[PDB]
Design a protein around this ligand. Structure first.
Ligand SMILES: CC(C)n1nc(-c2cccc(O)c2)c2c(N)ncnc21
Length: 247
């Protein structure tokens, strides 16, 4: 049965509840997060095969119900909470582009590795100290049309979501497509609609969103492209950038 990721439940001290399965902060045998699932192995092979700096790191599993997935602790919760908290009003484009870059990097690794995330959006990004961001957790509004309608999930659909994630970052956590219910979105993105440029955000960054929301999966950029473009941004793209009232 068990593989070398197995640890005994006894080695874990659950302490702070973080959200309700459930997520607890804890101790081993080392501060850790434990995801717990309300009463499986094959579909956990994903997180065990992928080790990288900008992806939340797996530490161990308890493969007996109730199942415990144990990972590194991300001191600042979801990117979505972080954007919506006290920190929101102090964030600007430098910080937000940089966060976007780290995510793109984790993702570009997933790309090399030949995997697909499937649920990429700020709720599944985790923030540590010093604005470290890490991809976690391997719905229509964040989904590419071909995936929402025909099940065609590929790294290209992940790219689509990334483009939506950039509106979350640049609106400091706002739900995409303000005012539309799901049906209206699916109907409208099919008719060709796309979110306009967020207030105070450079046209060049909204242009990058639009390449991500190209109707042809194959024509959307690579994450490796996104990673570099975001890394090089305030030199190669907006050298004249000045801080606004919000970005
Ligand atoms: C935001 C939420 C309570 N949370 N989920 C976490 C996890 C998210 C996704 C999968 C996990 O196994 C655990 C997490 C963490 N590792 N550190 C701190 N907070 C965390």
């Amino acid at each position: 049965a068990k593989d070398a990721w197995e640890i005994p439940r006894e080695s874990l001290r659950l302490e702070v509840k973080l959200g309700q399965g459930e997520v607890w902060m804890g101790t081993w045998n080392t501060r850790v997060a434990i995801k717990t699932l309300k009463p499986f192995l094959q579909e956990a092979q994903v997180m065990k095969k992928l080790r990288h700096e900008k992806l939340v790191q797996l530490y161990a599993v308890v493969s007996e119900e109730p199942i415990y997935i144990v990972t590194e602790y991300m001191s600042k919760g979801s990117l979505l909470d972080f954007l919506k908290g006290e920190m929101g009003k102090y964030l600007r484009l430098p910080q937000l582009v940089d966060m976007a870059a780290q995510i793109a990097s984790g993702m570009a690794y997933v790309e090399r590795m030949n995997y697909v995330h499937r649920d990429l959006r700020a709720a599944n990004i985790l923030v540590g100290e010093n604005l470290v961001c890490k991809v976690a957790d391997f719905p229509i509004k964040w989904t590419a049309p071909e995936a929402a309608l025909y099940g065609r999930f590929t790294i290209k659909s992940d790219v689509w979501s990334f483009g939506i994630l950039l509106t979350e970052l640049t609106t400091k956590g706002r739900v995409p497509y303000p005012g539309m219910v799901n049906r209206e979105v699916l109907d409208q993105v099919e008719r060709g609609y796309r979110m306009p440029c967020p207030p105070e955000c450079p046209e060049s960054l909204h242009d990058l969103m639009c390449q991500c929301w190209r109707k042809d999966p194959e024509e959307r950029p690579t994450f490796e492209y996104l990673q570099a473009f975001l890394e090089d941004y305030f030199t190669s793209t907006e050298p004249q950038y000045q801080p606004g009232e919000n970005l």
